[PDB]
Amino acid sequence: ADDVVDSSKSFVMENFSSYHGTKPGYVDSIQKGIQKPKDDDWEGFYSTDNKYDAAGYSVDNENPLSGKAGGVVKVTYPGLTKVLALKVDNAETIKKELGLSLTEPLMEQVGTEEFIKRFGDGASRVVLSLPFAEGSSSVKYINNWEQAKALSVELEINFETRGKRGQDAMYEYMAQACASCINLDWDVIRDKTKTKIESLKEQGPIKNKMSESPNKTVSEEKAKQYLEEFHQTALEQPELSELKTVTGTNPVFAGANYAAWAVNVAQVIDSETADNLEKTTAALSILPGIGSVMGIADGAVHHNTEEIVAQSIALSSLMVAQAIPLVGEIGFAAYNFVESIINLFQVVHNSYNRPAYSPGHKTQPFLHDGYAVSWNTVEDSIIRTGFQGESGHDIKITAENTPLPIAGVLLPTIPGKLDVNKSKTHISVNGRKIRMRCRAIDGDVTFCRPKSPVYVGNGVHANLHVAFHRSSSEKIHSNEISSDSIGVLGYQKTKVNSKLSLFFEIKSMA
Amino acid sequence: ADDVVDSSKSFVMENFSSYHGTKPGYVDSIQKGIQKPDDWEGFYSTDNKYDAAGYSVDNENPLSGKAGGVVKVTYPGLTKVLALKVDNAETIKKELGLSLTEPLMEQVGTEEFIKRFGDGASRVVLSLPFAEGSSSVKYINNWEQAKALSVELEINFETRGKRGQDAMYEYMAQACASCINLDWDVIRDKTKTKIESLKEQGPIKNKMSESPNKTVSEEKAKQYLEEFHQTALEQPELSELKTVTGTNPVFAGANYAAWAVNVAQVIDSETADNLEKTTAALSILPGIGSVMGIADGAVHHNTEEIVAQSIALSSLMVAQAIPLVGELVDGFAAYNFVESIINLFQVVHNSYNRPAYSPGHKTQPFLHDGYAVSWNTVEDSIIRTGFQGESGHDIKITAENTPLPIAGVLLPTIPGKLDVNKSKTHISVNGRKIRMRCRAIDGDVTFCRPKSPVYVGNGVHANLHVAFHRSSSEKIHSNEISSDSIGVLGYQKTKVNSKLSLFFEIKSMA
Ligand SMILES: Nc1ncnc2c1ncn2[C@@H]1O[C@H](CO)[C@@H](OP(=O)(O)OC[C@H]2O[C@@H](n3ccc(=O)[nH]c3=O)[C@H](O)[C@@H]2OP(=O)(O)O)[C@H]1O
Ligand SMILES: Nc1ncnc2c1ncn2[C@@H]1O[C@H](CO)[C@@H](OP(=O)(O)OC[C@H]2O[C@@H](n3ccc(=O)[nH]c3=O)[C@H](O)[C@@H]2OP(=O)(O)O)[C@H]1O
C-alpha cells in the first residue's frame, strides 16, 4: 500500500475545492450539480488544482482547434475530504497493493464506505490525485461519480459571456498565470491588422507592384521570386515601419521566408478548406516556417507588441493574397487565414508563457550545429555542495549525420574548494573509454581534452563523465562561481569552436 | 548490503584471468610480475582484451604514437569477483559497514574483508561496468594481492612491425569477425601508387598549370578546387570513386573542396612537420565524413580500393589548396597528411564496428528535419507482453530553433490483443495537456491527431504519452506486428510528412 500511495502528498482538508473545464452549452447546467452523463477503472469526474489547466478543457469538442471555449467552474465538497495521491496510474497495480477486488472497477471501489473507512482518515470521502501531466506541476483529481453529487458548483469564468472573437477570452485568461509574459490585447491586434491591410493595398508602390503580377499560375520559382519582390516594396511602406526594423538582421525573418510561407499556404488551401475555419487551422497548423511570421526564433518571441504582431500578420495576409493566383486551387487571405493564424499565434505564445526548462537544462537537449547534447539524468545536472569528496556527472553527446568531432570540455573550478578529479573524468564513444588530459586555463576554468579523437554522428554517441572533487565541506557561494554551464567544444570553424552548453545548478544535500 | 552489491554478476572462479593494456616499453617488463610504481588505488584490468588494447598507446603521443600490447593475468586458485552497483567509495563503506577512514581498496586486501566477502576464495577482485555503452567490465585488484598474478603475453603490437597504429586497430577489428576489417597495408600502398600516377595524368597536369598558384580568396580557391575535383574524378585511378560518390550530396566535389580549404588553413610549417600536431589539428575539423564516405549511419567507403581512392583524391586537393590559402611545403599533402587521416579513418571505423543503439532505439535520440525525439527511458521503449492490461510509454519531442508542428503519431495495433487506450494517450506541450483523436488506418496501424495544435522548438518541448491495452494474455508473436517503430509525424512538405521514428522491442515480463 505504501508502494502506491505518496503519503507525503496526501492530506485531509475541509471545503476541498478544485476546478473543472466546461464546454459551450454546460457552463450553466453544470452549476445545478455534477451528474454522470448517460477503461472503466478510471471512470469518474475529473478536476484539477489549476484553473488555467481546467480552461484547456473548455473548447468545443466538435471544433477543438478553433471552436468556442465554454468556461471553468469551481467545485467544493462540504466537510472533510481525503486527497489520496498515487505514485502510479496502473489500476491493476493499485488494486493489488491496496487489497481491493481485482475484478471490480477501481473508481467504483474508491466510492464505497469500506474504502473510505480504510483510506479516508476520517474524511467523508476520498478523491484520488495524480500528476496532471509531464512538464506540469499541477495535479488531476479523480472523483467517484456518486460522491461527486455532494459538490457545490460555482462559476469561475464564462468565456462566452466575454463576447470576444475566436478563442481570445480563453488565451487572455490563461496569460494571467504569468501576470517573460506575453500578455497581448488581441482586440487591438485584430483592429490594427484590418486597418493596415486596407491601407497597405492603397499604397502607390504596392498598387504598382500589384499590377506587375503575372496574376496567373506560374512556377514556385517565379512565384517566390515575385513574392520576395512584393515583400520588399511592402516592407518599405510606413504601415510596416517597425516591422522593417525588427526583421532586418535575423535570417529567420527574411522576405524569402515570408515568401516561402505564402507559397505553402496557397498550395494546401482549396475551396472547401478556406470556407471552414476548423479545416483551415488543421491545414495551416501542420506547415513549417510559421516562426518567420510569428517572429519566434532562438528561444524567444521577438514580435511581442500588438503593433508589430499586427504588422507581421498584415504583411503575411497580403503575401498570401498575391500567391494564390500564382499557385492557388480570394477573400480567404483576409478572412479565415487571419482568424486561423491568430489562433496559432495564441497557441505558441501560451507555450512560451508556461514554465519550461530551456535547452541544456535538466534533461532537455541542447541542439546546435548538428550536435545534440544533454545531461543523462536530472541529478547529473546538479552539483551538490556542503561535503568533502566526489561526485560524477554524465552528459550524452551525439550528432545528426556525418562524424563531427568533440575537441574537449570547459569545466568550472573553485580555487581551494572545487576541482576536477582528473583520474575519473573521461569520455566514452560507443563503449570505447577515452582518457582525458585536463589543464587549468586559470583558477576558475579547466579544459579537458580527450587523449584520442572523439567523433559522434548517426550511430555514434558518447558519454562524457565529469568528476568533481570537493576539498572542503564548505557550501559553495554564488559569488565563488561565474559560469553556470559546462562547455563542450565541437568542431572548429577568427577561429571559434561550436559551443554546446550544459547548464547546472548548485544545491545543498538532501 | 544488497544495496551496493550485484550478486547476479558476482561469482567465484578458479584461475580467474583478465586483460591489461600495456604501454610501449613495459610489454616485457610487466610479465615479470604486477608491481606498483586512495580509495581506488589499485591495479586495473578488464574482461575484454580488445578494450584492454585501448589502453596501450603511448601516453605522451596518444593521437599518433605507438601501441604497446595486451597481457593476460591469471590468479591461481579461487577468486571472488565482487560486482558493485555504484562507484562512490564513501557510499560503499557505509552501506557495507566497513571503516570510513581506510581506503576501500586497501580494506579489500585484508583477511577480514576476504573472509567476509570471498565466499571461500583466496582474494576478492572488484568488478564495475567498464563504461557507458559497453558490455565489458573493469576489475580493480588490491596491489599486494596482485603479486600473486601470473602474467602472460596476449599480443605485442610493435612486434607486428606495422605502420602507424594499424596493428592495434586491426586487432580491435577482430571483435566483429557489418564489420569493417580493412587491410591498411594494402590501402597505404594503393594510396601512394594512385597519388603518383594521378599527378602524371595529362588533364591533371593541365589543370594544375591553370592554378593561380598564389594566395587568393577562398571563394576563388573553392571554385578552382571544384574544377580540379571533377577533372581528377574523370581519371581511371578514381573510376569507382566517381561512381560511389555521384548521388549522395555528402560526397560531392564541393565538400571535398571545403575540406581541402579548411586543411590548408590550419596547417602551419611546425604543425605539418609533426604527426601528433597534424592529427590534433585535423581532428577538430568538420566535414571529414565527405572523405571517409560516412553518412546516414553507414560507412559507405568500405573496400580497400575505394578508401585509397578517396584518400588519394583528398591528398591531391590539399596539395592544390595550400598555395591558394596556406603557407607550407606542399610535401605535407602526401606524407603526414596521409598518415594522419589514416589514423582518423581507423578511429571512426572502430566506432562503427562497436555495438551501439541506433537513433531512436532505447534512449538514443532520433535527429531529423530540425526535430529531436527519444524514448524517455529504456523501459518506455519496451512493449511488454504476456498479460492482460495497460502500459504507458513516454516519448520526448522538441526542435532546434523555430516552432515546428507535430501533426500526429502512427501507432501499432494487433487486431486481436493490442489496442491504443484512447483516453490515456495524450501529448503535453510545456505542461499543457492536449488530448488526441485516434482513428484506425487498417487493422494494424492507428493514427492519433492532437486536438489543439502542437508546436515544438527552442524552449518548447512535448511529452507524448502512448497507452496500450492488451485484451488477452497471449504473448505477441512476430507475425502479428509489421513495423518495429512508432511513427511521429512532423510538418508536411505529392504531400508527405516528416517522419520521426522511435523503435520499440517486444519482450515478455521479467
Ligand atoms: N453536470 C455535469 N456533470 C458532470 N459532467 C458534465 C456536466 N455537464 C457537462 N459535463 C461534461 O461531461 C464530461 C464528464 O464530466 C465532461 O466533458 P467531456 O467533454 O466529455 O470531457 C472530455 C474529457 O476531458 C476530461 N476532463 C474534462 C474537464 C476537466 O477539467 N478535466 C478533465 O480531465 C474528462 O475526464 C473527459 O475524459 P474522457 O471522456 O476521455 O474520460 C464535462 O465537462
Ligand atoms: N609491472 C607492472 N605492474 C603494474 N603496472 C605496470 C607495470 N609496468 C607498467 N605498468 C603500467 O603502470 C600503470 C599502473 O598499472 C599502467 O599504465 P598507465 O599508463 O599509468 O595507465 C593509465 C590508466 O589506465 C588504467 N588502465 C590501464 C590498463 C587497463 O587495462 N585498464 C585500465 O583501467 C590504469 O589504471 C591507469 O589509471 P591511473 O593513471 O589513474 O593510475 C600500467 O600499464
Numbering used by the authors:
A (entry chain A): 2 to 39, 47 to 187, 200 to 349, 353 to 516, 521 to 537
B (entry chain B): 2 to 38, 48 to 187, 200 to 352, 354 to 516, 521 to 537
Text of the article:
Protonation of key histidine residues has been long implicated in the acid-mediated cellular action of the diphtheria toxin translocation (T-) domain, responsible for the delivery of the catalytic domain into the cell. The function of the T-domain is to translocate the catalytic domain across the lipid bilayer in response to the acidification of the endosome. Remarkably, such a complex task is performed by this small 180-residue protein without the help of any additional translocation machinery. Formation of the membrane-competent W+-state occurs in solution upon acidification of the environment to pH below 6 and is accompanied by structural destabilization and partial unfolding of the T-domain.
In order to further analyze the putative pH-dependent structuring of the TH2-TH3 region, we crystallized a full-length form of diphtheria toxin (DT) harboring the H223Q/H257Q mutations. Interestingly, the TH2 helices in the mutant structures are well ordered in a similar manner as observed for the WT pH 7.0 structure and could be modeled on the electron density maps. Interestingly, the Q223/Q257 sidechain conformations are distinctly different from the H223/H257 residues in the WT structures. Concerted movement of Q223, Q257, and E259 in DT-DM-B results in the formation of new hydrogen bond interactions, as shown in Figure 4.
